[PDB]
Amino acid sequence: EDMLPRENFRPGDRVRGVLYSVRPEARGAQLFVTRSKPEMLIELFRIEVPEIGEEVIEIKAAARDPGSRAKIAVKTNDKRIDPVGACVGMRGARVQAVSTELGGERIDIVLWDDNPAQFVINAMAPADVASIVVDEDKHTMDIAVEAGNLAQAIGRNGQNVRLASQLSGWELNVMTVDDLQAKHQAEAHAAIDTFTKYLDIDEDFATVLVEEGFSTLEELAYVPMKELLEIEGLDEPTVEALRERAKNALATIAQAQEESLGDNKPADDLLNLEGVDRDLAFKLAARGVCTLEDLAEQGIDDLADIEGLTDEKAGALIMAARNICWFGDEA
Amino acid sequence: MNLTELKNTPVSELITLGENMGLENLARMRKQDIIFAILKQHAKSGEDIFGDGVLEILQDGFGFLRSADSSYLAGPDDIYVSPSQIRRFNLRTGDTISGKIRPPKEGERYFALLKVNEVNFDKPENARNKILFENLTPLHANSRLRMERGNGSTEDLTARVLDLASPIGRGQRGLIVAPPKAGKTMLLQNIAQSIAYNHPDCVLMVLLIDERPEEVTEMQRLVKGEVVASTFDEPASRHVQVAEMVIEKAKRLVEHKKDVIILLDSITRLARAYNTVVPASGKVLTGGVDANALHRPKRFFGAARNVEEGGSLTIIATALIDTGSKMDEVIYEEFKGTGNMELHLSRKIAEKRVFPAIDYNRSGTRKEELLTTQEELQKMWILRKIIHPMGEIDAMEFLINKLAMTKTNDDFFEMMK
Amino acid sequence: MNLTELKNTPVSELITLGENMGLENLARMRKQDIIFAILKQHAKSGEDIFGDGVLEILQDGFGFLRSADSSYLAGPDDIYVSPSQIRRFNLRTGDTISGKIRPPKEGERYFALLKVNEVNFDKPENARNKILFENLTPLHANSRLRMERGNGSTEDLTARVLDLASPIGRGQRGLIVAPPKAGKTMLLQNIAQSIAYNHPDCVLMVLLIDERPEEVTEMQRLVKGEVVASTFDEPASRHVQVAEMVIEKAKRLVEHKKDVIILLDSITRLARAYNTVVPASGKVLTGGVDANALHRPKRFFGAARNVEEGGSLTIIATALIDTGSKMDEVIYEEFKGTGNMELHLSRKIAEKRVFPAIDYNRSGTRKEELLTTQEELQKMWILRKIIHPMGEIDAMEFLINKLAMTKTNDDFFEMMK
Numbered sequence A: 001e002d003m004l005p006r007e008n009f010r011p012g013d014r015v016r017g018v019l020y021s022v023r024p025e026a027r028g029a030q031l032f033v034t035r036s037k038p039e040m041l042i043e044l045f046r047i048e049v050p051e052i053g054e055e056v057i058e059i060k061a062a063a064r065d066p067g068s069r070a071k072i073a074v075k076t077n078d079k080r081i082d083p084v085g086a087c088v089g090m091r092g093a094r095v096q097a098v099s100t101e102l103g104g105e106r107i108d109i110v111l112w113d114d115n116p117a118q119f120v121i122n123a124m125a126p127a128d129v130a131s132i133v134v135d136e137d138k139h140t141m142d143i144a145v146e147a148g149n150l151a152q153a154i155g156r157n158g159q160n161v162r163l164a165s166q167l168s169g170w171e172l173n174v175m176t177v178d179d180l181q182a183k184h185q186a187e188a189h190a191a192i193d194t195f196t197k198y199l200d201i202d203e204d205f206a207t208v209l210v211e212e213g214f215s216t217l218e219e220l221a222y223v224p225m226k227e228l229l230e231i232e233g234l235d236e237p238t239v240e241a242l243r244e245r246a247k248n249a250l251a252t253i254a255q256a257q258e259e260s261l262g263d264n265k266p267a268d269d270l271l272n273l274e275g276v277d278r279d280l281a282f283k284l285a286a287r288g289v290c291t292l293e294d295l296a297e298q299g300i301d302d303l304a305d306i307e308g309l310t311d312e313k314a315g316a317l318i319m320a321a322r323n324i325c326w327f328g329d330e331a
Numbered sequence B, C: 001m002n003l004t005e006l007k008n009t010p011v012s013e014l015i016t017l018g019e020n021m022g023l024e025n026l027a028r029m030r031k032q033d034i035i036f037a038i039l040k041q042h043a044k045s046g047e048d049i050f051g052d053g054v055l056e057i058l059q060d061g062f063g064f065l066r067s068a069d070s071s072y073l074a075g076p077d078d079i080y081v082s083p084s085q086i087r088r089f090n091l092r093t094g095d096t097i098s099g100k101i102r103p104p105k106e107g108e109r110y111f112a113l114l115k116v117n118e119v120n121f122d123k124p125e126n127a128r129n130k131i132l133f134e135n136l137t138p139l140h141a142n143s144r145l146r147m148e149r150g151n152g153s154t155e156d157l158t159a160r161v162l163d164l165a166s167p168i169g170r171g172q173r174g175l176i177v178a179p180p181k182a183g184k185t186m187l188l189q190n191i192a193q194s195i196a197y198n199h200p201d202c203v204l205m206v207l208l209i210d211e212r213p214e215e216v217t218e219m220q221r222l223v224k225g226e227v228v229a230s231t232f233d234e235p236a237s238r239h240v241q242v243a244e245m246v247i248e249k250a251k252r253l254v255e256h257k258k259d260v261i262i263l264l265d266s267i268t269r270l271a272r273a274y275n276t277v278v279p280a281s282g283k284v285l286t287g288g289v290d291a292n293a294l295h296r297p298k299r300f301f302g303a304a305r306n307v308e309e310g311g312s313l314t315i316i317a318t319a320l321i322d323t324g325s326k327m328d329e330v331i332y333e334e335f336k337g338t339g340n341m342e343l344h345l346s347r348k349i350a351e352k353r354v355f356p357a358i359d360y361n362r363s364g365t366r367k368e369e370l371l372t373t374q375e376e377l378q379k380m381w382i383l384r385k386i387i388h389p390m391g392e393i394d395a396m397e398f399l400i401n402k403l404a405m406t407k408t409n410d411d412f413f414e415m416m417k
């Protein structure tokens, strides 16, 4: 699994790596050495770069998509050295050496910063990014790029991005480049249908105030008066209208969850046989099929081992399906 | 196409070339068969092949030309030469050959030789009527090898002390007697560096037997000359093979009037490998040592000499002692009165972080009058008589303090007066 | 959990803790494995372990952190530190380390270090770029160590006479030349008490080599500072081990700019142990003494000096003489012109119940002008010239009668006029 389609082997050559796991209680060979681990290149620099090892520099991060892209991020705690200029050598002399030692993998020394914003900006360099957003509750980073440097923005498999999503550990978001790509105003006035029936008496009170969310209504329903002061007129009718809107939101969220858990849409075209019940077909179609046109192509692999079925019942159901689909040829 | 460009090139350029030639998946096999298939393809689409190497004649009759980087090992990269060349040009084992070669057809797989071009860096006409190695007349060393570079670096002072304790010349035998942990590797490295910087005309050869591979790779690209080494990774058969290879190469080169210089490390390990590789003769001493088992190592150490006709051969083989076993001990006893220049490196000074740890009291060289001048020899004798009453560590630090201030041994001698 | 709370606690609380933890019968084994099992249990149910000690680097490559109360001896209580720390923080033998440690799994039994916190009571960043011990520039003592407490007790008068005969300063070498039966133990005890009461900022260390164990236990809890002692109960190997331990600790502390003070007793026994522990070099004098056998003791006595950059090291080693053998005699001859402050305690005055028995005529200190003022030195010289024509016992009783009435040496000097 740590090998590559281009990293190649035959008895006789010397391949190096880092001993990553040792299982002396195993049955046979128990000296497990890997190569795709990031810190590997770190130690490579340790045996090549004189700046590392003496604490004068600090190799912090390493994003390694093996065979695709191997970037390194370092930081200098001293005030008389540079992070990238000293480690590159003399116009790609030692970095290219460690690259051709690793297998000619493209190695670009990136400079991480104390904040994830500049970190992911440099990780996708040299290229422009029109929007950088961080999200903690989603554990993600929205990186919206501009047109003009796409040849360096994505590349193959989005490698210039694939490293960042692999380095920070957060599944980034680089999807859309059209209007409202900033993700800061992409939800301010793009989905206006939030207060469907809230101000039922009139409409001319003041400008809308989105800075609360209008959708949570769990951190907003029952709060002290100092948090609901952003909108004036917090009387009993107003709080009751808010509670009614929160109840409607709860009902809608419950319906959405009930619909999303069952990603099958079980209609009445599913219980025409003898012996088929709700959970049977639920599981059978949650295994990856949709309707009757995609079930006769299987056998005891999928239809067996279901809650409430026996191997003989599975054989019976599969022969009935094959006779109604393969042996009947009707539509 | 020439062979050395594809031999000493990194394997990455070979992978790129093989992928550009539109061939099978090349990076999945050894470097040996990789370059073999590359040469085969370039011959299928191209001109004759140009190869080179060192020749070894088996007991079968034919010959194999092997490259230096593989330590002269068997494989697809070897060059088959028929006995017809060995009858026409009267070839011998260890002949440095370079010439034209052709691809093989069915029944064969090695590149057959077509026409020799350079034999031991010489014309075949001049090499036809020549003089044998053993037929030469040995002599004492007359031209001293200057080991001082003149810059006076932080570590070249080692070499300086060497010039102070063991004047080396073309045709001398050097035995470095040092226990482990003593720091002889960088010593030999600096010796090779200085002898290549001061005497770049003479060929320089090093030999690492039963050595760690990391040192092999770090020495094969730090010093000049082909660094042939047989690490401990392989059995003793490869060790005796490379020993014969290097000794025959040196013999041929000195027969062609070239000053050959061999650096061998260590000689005790080579003799142990010899002992386990050659069949036993029945007689066995303590430590598992045979009688005839030392004959071939002895010969190897005796090959070095100062030829009166032309050129010379200077070997410097280090003897590893103080290991606990009896093999190294009996080897050092058998080789004690063998070399004409011993250099003792006591571990007592090495463990005290005082380098170079050199036992100047027990070191010396015979017939040094034929290597140094009169007043130089007088100053050396005065310094020896002065240092002899001192111990080892104290004398070593005194010499270090007296040599650090000066940059040249001549100013050192005149300031010691 | 911290280590020192369980180290310096009585074994009874350890027995109670081990019985409360619901463990095996704990009181049936050494204190060492008792505290080892206690730490193992507290780590199995608890947080990381917090350990400390002094580091010793073997010839193997790793390091052992040992505690002070066991005189830095091997056992389950030691802390294993990998060579990776010795390469990262560039550790050295004798480094006072304190930090986090973890329990061992299969293949290991010692608590492995996790992260250092305090190295020689200093930050690793400040200790990284530092100055070596031998690279410092020794000098003469300038700041005099005041040994008078001021209370004028029944026995502090001893210390007073000491101030009268040997002004001690930061960086001086003191040699107490006294036969047995003479009363030097309580003398050194009072010296340590006074130097800790007057100068509590400087570290104080005592060393009892080949001493009775009762004195070890009664001194390890009567004076300040860690009382490290290697009694005669163990072979000379432990003696040289603790000698290196304490000397490297002192070297590191003085490299970290700390005034270190060593009290060594006795030096003849330490040199004898050195003589029997280090291999012989062939040359032997009368009394069974080797030549190099005194080299390491000499070094140990020469380590003390007054550093110009920062801090100093003051050793006070007592030489036991008049025993009958020749070892002590030749040791005292070799160390006679070594220390710059001798203090002779003749047994003739000691056997007469006249304490302190101090040979003021034969005692003295060089370069005392850099420790005392002008008129103080003039009064000292006047007193010396007055006492010199007198003998030993008469002068001693005269000094005792003249010092008992006064409480301070200044009033004593002015009343002696």
Ligand SMILES: Nc1ncnc2c1ncn2[C@@H]1O[C@H](COP(=O)(O)OP(=O)(O)O)[C@@H](O)[C@H]1O
Pocket: C154, C155, C158, C179, C180, C181, C182, C183, C184, C185, C186, C187, C355, C356
């Ligand atoms: N200042 C003092 N006052 C009273 N007695 C003393 C004094 N100093 C020493 N002594 C006596 O001298 C004896 C010395 O014993 P010990 O400590 O074994 O000698 P040493 O110290 O020479 O080995 C003690 O028994 C003690 O009573």
Ligand code: BEF
Pocket: C179, C180, C181, C182, C183, C184, C185
């Ligand atoms: F305690 Be005695 F001076 F040996």
Ligand SMILES: [Mg+2]
Pocket: C184, C185
């Ligand atoms: Mg005593």
